[PDB]
Amino acid sequence: PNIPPPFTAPYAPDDAEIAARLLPASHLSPPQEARIHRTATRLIEAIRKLGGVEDMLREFALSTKEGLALMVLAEALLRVPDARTADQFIEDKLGEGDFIHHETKSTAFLVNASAWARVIQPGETPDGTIGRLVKRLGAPAVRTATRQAMRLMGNHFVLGETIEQALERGKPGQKTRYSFDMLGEGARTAADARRYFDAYASAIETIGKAAGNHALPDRPGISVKLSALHPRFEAISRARVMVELVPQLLDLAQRAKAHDLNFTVDAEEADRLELSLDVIAATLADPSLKGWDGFGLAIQAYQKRASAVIDYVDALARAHDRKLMVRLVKGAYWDTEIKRAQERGLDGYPVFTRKAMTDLNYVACASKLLALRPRIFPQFATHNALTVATVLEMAEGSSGFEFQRLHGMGEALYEQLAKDHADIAYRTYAPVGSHRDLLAYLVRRLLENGANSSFVAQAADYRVPVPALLQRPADAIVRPQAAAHPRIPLPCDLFAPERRNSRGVEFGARTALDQLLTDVKAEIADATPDQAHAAVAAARAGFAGWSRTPAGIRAAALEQAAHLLESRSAHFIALLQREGGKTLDDALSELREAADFCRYYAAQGRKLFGSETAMPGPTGESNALTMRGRGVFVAISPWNFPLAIFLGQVTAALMAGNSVVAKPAEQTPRIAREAVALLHEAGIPKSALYLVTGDGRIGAALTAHPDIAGVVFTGSTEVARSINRALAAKDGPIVPLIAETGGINAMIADATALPEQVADYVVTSAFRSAGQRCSALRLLFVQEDVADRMIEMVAGAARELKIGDPSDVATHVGPVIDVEAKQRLDAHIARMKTEARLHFAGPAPEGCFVAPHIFELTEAGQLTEEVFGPILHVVRYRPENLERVLRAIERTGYGLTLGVHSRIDDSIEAIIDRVQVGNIYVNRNMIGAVVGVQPFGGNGLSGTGPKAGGPHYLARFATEQTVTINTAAAG
Amino acid sequence: IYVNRNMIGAVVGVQPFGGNGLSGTGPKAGGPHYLARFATEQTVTINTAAAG
Amino acid sequence: KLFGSETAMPGPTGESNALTMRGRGVFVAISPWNFPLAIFLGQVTAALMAGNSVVAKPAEQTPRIAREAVALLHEAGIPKSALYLVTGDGRIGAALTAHPDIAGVVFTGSTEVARSINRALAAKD
Amino acid sequence: AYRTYAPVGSHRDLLAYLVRRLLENGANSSFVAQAADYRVPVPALLQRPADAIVRPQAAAHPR
Ligand SMILES: Cc1cc2nc3c(=O)[nH]c(=O)nc-3n(C[C@H](O)[C@H](O)[C@H](O)COP(=O)(O)OP(=O)(O)OC[C@H]3O[C@@H](n4cnc5c(N)ncnc54)[C@H](O)[C@@H]3O)c2cc1C
Ligand SMILES: Cc1cc2nc3c(=O)[nH]c(=O)nc-3n(C[C@H](O)[C@H](O)[C@H](O)COP(=O)(O)OP(=O)(O)OC[C@H]3O[C@@H](n4cnc5c(N)ncnc54)[C@H](O)[C@@H]3O)c2cc1C
């Protein structure tokens, strides 16, 4: 049969339609249900008859953060050479003080062994995760919880500083009772991708030398992650991924085949499904994998596409005439998928949103997989007693499949299953790898053991009666229309009923990305000072009628502008790419933001200007407060968000009842002209909105005009002051100036932060849009104990960014706006090269490009200007010198964005309390403020306020009027 | 604006008082838009996904 | 109502977004002779309420009431370090408003003086 | 100094004693029960009685 086409199932179909088929098909005869019920009751009875992570979380009532901190402290304590020394520490030091120090050191130990190896003053304020733990449970219970974490870490994990040390520790002249769930994921650098490859290769040899003499399926397996093997494993980098990753995955599959092992490609996020299936298919196709039945992959039942992934895998197996071992799981990234679909404004969720639907689809999928025997050998990975009992019933035997579990979970379940059914096979995986890969793995692990819907958690809570654990999924759903979770809105309804959300696109769905790429590919004289003056006068004339147009009618025009923007998204995205130099995601994002500005100011507009506010007062008198347009606003906009900031400023002014003269940046008048024509078409009268183009001279003519009633300006600090001076110089009214200006934006990362995550956030914040965002990271402060690893990881990550033509989908970093910008940037770079350590200087293509650069400074004071390009500055610091760091941030006088990366709530809160920055971003990137979600704007040298996209913005464009009427003659 | 009564003696919280043009910048003293002008906004955005 | 608590913003799951309002810094309060108690206290307590510290310069003709008011505020709970009274002419007012460390001016008085204050502010770097 | 008492007697007198004993160990307001529930932070166990009452008129239980 034919090799199947590239996988392209619909990403997020409707749950009800799926439920309409799954509900009737799940029906079981009374004797089938009786067997299921009995088997499952027995399994749970055994479960409720050792210790696991969930038990520790439940016993001390620990959050996932606290669980994490104790397990990290436990691993550090287990690696102390002399056990008595750890014992001394636990009793004498732990819980007595140095709470943050212990948490910081034990976490740093995971990337910098040297870091972990003092005298504690009494009466120390208990802060940090551990100190807060101690205030809550008492120091003695914390010691007890750490010792339990120590038994868990020592018994359920195979760990070392290096893979060689992990592998040596996990050794059995016999066979290992465990398959390896390797720790690695998401290479950030080319060197990370090689390290993980070598770890996998080394693991396979160790596993091989101890594999026993039986045939599959009774040989050990290894689990592998595509993201570990390639530093840009993403849909937009598919071309380079097919060429680079496939040979590497092939090399490991071959090494595995030589020991006749089970080799399994793990399933990761929904946006990587298609790409992974492409990688897997091309790899499987190689003739070198013939005559071996161990190749396989995981398939996630929580996805709506799961059943189609099974069809695809089967056709693949028939086309190449292979036997595959296929792992069926529910799925480990549920929270991530919900969040991403909301952020990306998708039209639905790739996963089910009711737990019972996952459970339903898992059983339907198991049923399908069982009938693909013997070509497919199904592996059912679950620790759910009901799921196990149900799959066992459907198999009608015990041959041709196995179950799977993770070391430290499901032990009692599968022991009992083995007693009641001697021919049952189950595979046990152990997590194996290096300390530097532990944190990322622990976080994912802890979300499921801490989940309340989790079977493992409930079974361990004796409040939950056994029969509750045995509810059939079909009886929890009942009706197809109930399939979706009622308390989780679709992304388009995220703000309902306040306003509609703009639509995004899933780049990981090739149908969506291809169409978007296709639609997009398918798509000005200056003004004289006299024309600018005529513009003001014409706007002054149109003001009277526009200010008196009812607020509902002004709002309707904004909402219609939003609708037309989204309807013509391809036209505007094409402009943003060609005139703005933006990558596809930046342009799409800008388009969304422009439409979000319209709907949001429209909604705030009705609330603010829709009706008067009655003031309390004496009887026989009415007092009403209203807000009226001010006059003609002059809107001056920058080149870097030439559509969204342009429209945000303009539609705010219009919404408040002002007429507008808008002057866009010299570099981007075409998009501004398309925007203005669009507003006119949406309902803005020709007499309320005028576009005037030209240089700073034209801008200065507008702002010097005696008849204007206010200025809204976004741009350089220097120009804002001159505008402010030109206004204050007039003898007329003092008009409002709203000025959003630059920043020297810092980020603080401590040693409790995950270095791979921070690296991601730093790369994005500093280098996305070639650093041409006002919110961009300019200055990273990183704690010395993790500084070398963090810097190396950011540098290695920056080197994987494709720089080039913005219209190419694979491009990460497009050109800077113009030659003058490139000249200023290249001059700062030349200076920094003689002044500070160069950690990275990327290769730029010929043309208007500047590549990411990373410099380390001796001190923050060496950075004195905002440099508007892809250039990161790094300062390493000592933990006790945080005060010097905070002062260094205060000293610039700026205050736009600040990033904070830390596990420690008390440190985060101490930083928030201290700084005056407009936008603080904790444990995520510092860019992409969402309208109505992150009201965006800074203070000090960074801006005047109020914040754009927030609830205090519109009022500033208007003036108040109080009407007081003596009503006593009416009675 | 005062209709069929005198033009003086604005009462705090009843007649938010203050003018525009050459008469003032705003916001009106004794009204609900006054305090905000003396303050600055701060947005704190926290990724809480690790907590669950 | 305004500073008592943060405003939760709508947003995606797995993320919190809170809007707060903080003091700006040092406010200079300049008040006229014609409502020497109420406009003095209106401007002063508003700035204080918003979380700013205040340097208040009353009109030359009415410092005695201004001093009694400031003393009364201290006694009612305003720390000495949050509120200071400076008396003198327009030149003293001009000293306060030209100072590079102040975070805002609240002014009631003549149109001509407002412009000169506004010019002195815009002149700063 | 502290004195420790042991329950001493015959089986025929146990049931009546156990019932009374079990009402206090099972009580949610019970200090012993709360201290053994790690959900309850140590500072909660240390609330002074006078601060739970606050006002004389609140002395009686409202429900
Ligand atoms: C050996 C092994 C290997 C694995 N490999 C992978 C892999 O490569 N990729 C991967 O993604 N997973 C993988 N998993 C699965 C993941 O790690 C979890 O263990 C698994 O999802 C838990 O399922 P369950 O039957 O044990 O538990 P349960 O408590 O029955 O099921 C919990 C699951 O339900 C789902 N869920 C929770 N809430 C909702 C909701 N509101 N709506 C819809 N669904 C919901 C989630 O998927 C959650 O994990 C693997 C598991 C094992 C044991
Ligand atoms: C050695 C010993 C001998 C004892 N002998 C006697 C005896 O002879 N007669 C006798 O009656 N008790 C006796 N008790 C007391 C009784 O057995 C309980 O042990 C005691 O009341 C618990 O108090 P506490 O300080 O340990 O615990 P706590 O948890 O502090 O206090 C619980 C007590 O609060 C009271 N209480 C609970 N709810 C309310 C409420 N809503 N309003 C008002 N009060 C409330 C009850 O008295 C309850 O026992 C004795 C206790 C001991 C240890």
Automatic annotation (TrEMBL), chain B:
Coiled-coil portions: none
Family to which this protein belongs: In the N-terminal section; belongs to the proline dehydrogenase family.
Protein function: Oxidizes proline to glutamate for use as a carbon and nitrogen source.
Record-given protein name: Bifunctional protein PutA
Organism: Bradyrhizobium diazoefficiens (strain JCM 10833 / BCRC 13528 / IAM 13628 / NBRC 14792 / USDA 110)
